[PDB]
Amino acid sequence: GANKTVVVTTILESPYVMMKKNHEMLEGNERYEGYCVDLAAEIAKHCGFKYKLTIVGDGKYGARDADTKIWNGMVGELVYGKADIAIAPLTITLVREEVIDFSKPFMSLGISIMIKKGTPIESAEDLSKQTEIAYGTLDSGSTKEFFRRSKIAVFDKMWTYMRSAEPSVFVRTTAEGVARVRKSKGKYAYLLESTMNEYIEQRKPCDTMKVGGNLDSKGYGIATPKGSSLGNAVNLAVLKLSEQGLLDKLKNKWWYDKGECGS
Amino acid sequence: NKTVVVTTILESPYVMMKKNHEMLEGNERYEGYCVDLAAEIAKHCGFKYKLTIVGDGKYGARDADTKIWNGMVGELVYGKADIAIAPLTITLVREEVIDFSKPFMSLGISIMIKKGTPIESAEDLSKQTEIAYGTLDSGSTKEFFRRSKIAVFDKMWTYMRSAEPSVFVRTTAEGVARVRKSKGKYAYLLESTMNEYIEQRKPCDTMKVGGNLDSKGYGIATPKGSSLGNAVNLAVLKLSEQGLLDKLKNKWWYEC
Numbered sequence: 001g002a003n004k005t006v007v008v009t010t011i012l013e014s015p016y017v018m019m020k021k022n023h024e025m026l027e028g029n030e031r032y033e034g035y036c037v038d039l040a041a042e043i044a045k046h047c048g049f050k051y052k053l054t055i056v057g058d059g060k061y062g063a064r065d066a067d068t069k070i071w072n073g074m075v076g077e078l079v080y081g082k083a084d085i086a087i088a089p090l091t092i093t094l095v096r097e098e099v100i101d102f103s104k105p106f107m108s109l110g111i112s113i114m115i116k117k118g119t120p121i122e123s124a125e126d127l128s129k130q131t132e133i134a135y136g137t138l139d140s141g142s143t144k145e146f147f148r149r150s151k152i153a154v155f156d157k158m159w160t161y162m163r164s165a166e167p168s169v170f171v172r173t174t175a176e177g178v179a180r181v182r183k184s185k186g187k188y189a190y191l192l193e194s195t196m197n198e199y200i201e202q203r204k205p206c207d208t209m210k211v212g213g214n215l216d217s218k219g220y221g222i223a224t225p226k227g228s229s230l231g232n233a234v235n236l237a238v239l240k241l242s243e244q245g246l247l248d249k250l251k252n253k254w255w256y257d258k259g260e261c262g263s
Numbered sequence: 264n265k266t267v268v269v270t271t272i273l274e275s276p277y278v279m280m281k282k283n284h285e286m287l288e289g290n291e292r293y294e295g296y297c298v299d300l301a302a303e304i305a306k307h308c309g310f311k312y313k314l315t316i317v318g319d320g321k322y323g324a325r326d327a328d329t330k331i332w333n334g335m336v337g338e339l340v341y342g343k344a345d346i347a348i349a350p351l352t353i354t355l356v357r358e359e360v361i362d363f364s365k366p367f368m369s370l371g372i373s374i375m376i377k378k379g380t381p382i383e384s385a386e387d388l389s390k391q392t393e394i395a396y397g398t399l400d401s402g403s404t405k406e407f408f409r410r411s412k413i414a415v416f417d418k419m420w421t422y423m424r425s426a427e428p429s430v431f432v433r434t435t436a437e438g439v440a441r442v443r444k445s446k447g448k449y450a451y452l453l454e455s456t457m458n459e460y461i462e463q464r465k466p467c468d469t470m471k472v473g474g475n476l477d478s479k480g481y482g483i484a485t486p487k488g489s490s491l492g493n494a495v496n497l498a499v500l501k502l503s504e505q506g507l508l509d510k511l512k513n514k515w516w517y518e519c
């Protein structure tokens with residue numbers, strides 16, 4: 001039928017999507033800025049559609065409840081028909097691929113470790129062999145599922161500890177994880193994606209560090225409901241943007257160009 | 264069902280002839296990362312398969328004149344093979360004619376020098392002429408330079424395409440040999456995965472310099488609209504999540 005405005009679900013997560021200074025004076029898409037805002041604009045341009053950015057209601061990436069088998073987060077928006085497309089740092093995973101489509105990845109990352117500087121930890125190994133320094137992950141996302149599902153010894157041991165720790169080591173948002181690392185005098189380390197880790201490492205007060213190698217290797221993709229007519233074009237747009245070097249530029253713009261911890 | 268025809272390419276350590284292969288037969292002739300991968304994929308998708316080395320020994324490019332596709336890509340496009348399991352780069356032009364799974368490995372274009380060569384970056388290469396440099400024929404690296412609007416890469420392209428003698432090579436091994444036999448006067452542009460594998464092998468006389476010039480992935484390819492596509496993609500994701508892709512990389516990139 002006639003062209004319709006495309007509903008883009010996304011998540012407030014720096015530096016992917018952030019409230020512009022003066023957002024209280026702005027409306028619609030103008031309220032926001034960031035890597036995924038820029039990406040959304042480029043994708044819409046290359047696929048020839050109009051769109052409306054909408055922050056996911058429950059503020060989550062997406063997990064399926066093991067009881068009700070209901071999906072929440074951005075994945076839920078797509079599965080239940082609330083949004084037409086998701087443009088966010090949304091990790092490509094098997095369980096998600098089974099219910100939604102993903103474009104080829106637009107960004108690579110791996111699970112990694114964030115510490116307050118000087119913390120005596122340099123690996124997942126180290127974390128698992130001690131109990132003084134607590135550690136956890138984001139709720140309702142791909143990192144928690146990674147530990148829950150892992151059959152690798154060190155990671156299995158970390159999960160056994162995490163899932164029962166008290167008080168809870170899990171946080172509802174990345175910002176909550178960061179604050180907890182920053183305020184815990186070295187007694188909390190945070191497991192998050194290297195992209196977010198690296199972004200925070202360049203933010204004031206420059207008191208956090210990525211340590212160790214990545215625990216795994218994967219990517220973010222743009223998601224659409226299964227069998228959506230947008231999928232193909234969006235995949236091509238991502239490949240074109242990648243090959244033009246636009247994704248590389250966008251990353252430097254939002255991570256490094258105006259980093260706050262020196263050159 | 265049918266025996267799935269797998270096209271692939273002799274490229275270490277992805278696919279290599281085993282020692283004594285001449286008395287061996289069929290799939291047992293070969294070993295390497297993609298050989299193991301093919302076995303895992305087949306097991307997870309429930310098919311039997313026959314590994315075959317691509318006839319012209321190429322990855323895949325479209326002729327600008329004829330617009331015919333060669334290499335593994337051509338074999339998919341013209342129905343000679345059902346699936347390609349090789350270090351085949353996901354690209355826009357290819358994706359327009361065949362299907363790719365989500366990537367099973369990451370890589371970027373990179374620079375290989377003979378140790379001691381006074382070069383640290385692509386920019387260095389482009390600002391001089393004592394040291395010649397080139398790429399593989401009929402693959403994504405050559406197209407990369409052909410299409411780049413980025414100044415440094417565009418300058419390298421301009422030099423490489425008119426250089427005499429030719430700086431382009433038919434196989435990765437000929438590029439590596441060329442770097443080794445050229446007394447520092449030839450540098451080779453190739454994917455970081457292959458660069459790093461070679462760097463760890465004797466005679467340990469080559470080196471990767473600079474960062475990767477780009478960032479991309481290898482994918483498993485099927486003819487456009489193949490029924491095999493979906494299952495293979497779920498297989499790659501499961502293998503990735505189970506840590507198996509990481510294990511295979513550690514095994515084949517285990518001299519120096």
Ligand SMILES: C[C@@H](CNS(C)(=O)=O)c1ccc(-c2ccc([C@@H](C)CNS(C)(=O)=O)cc2)cc1
Nearest residue numbers: 104105107108217218219365366368369479480
């Ligand atoms: C820079 C962009 C370019 N993306 S593109 C489509 O041009 O290739 C990029 C992002 C991610 C990767 C990448 C490659 C391989 C792997 C496997 C280890 C896992 N693969 S998966 C889909 O299950 O996460 C993960 C991520 C490569 C490139």
Ligand SMILES: N[C@@H](CCC(=O)O)C(=O)O
Nearest residue numbers: 061089090091141142143
């Ligand atoms: N990108 C992740 C969220 C971040 C994390 O889990 O660390 C996801 O899609 O679930």
Ligand SMILES: N[C@@H](CCC(=O)O)C(=O)O
Nearest residue numbers: 322350351352402403404
């Ligand atoms: N992986 C490349 C071949 C090697 C190269 O181009 O450097 C391709 O699929 O074309």
Ligand SMILES: [Cl-]
Nearest residue numbers: 281282283284
């Ligand atoms: Cl032999």
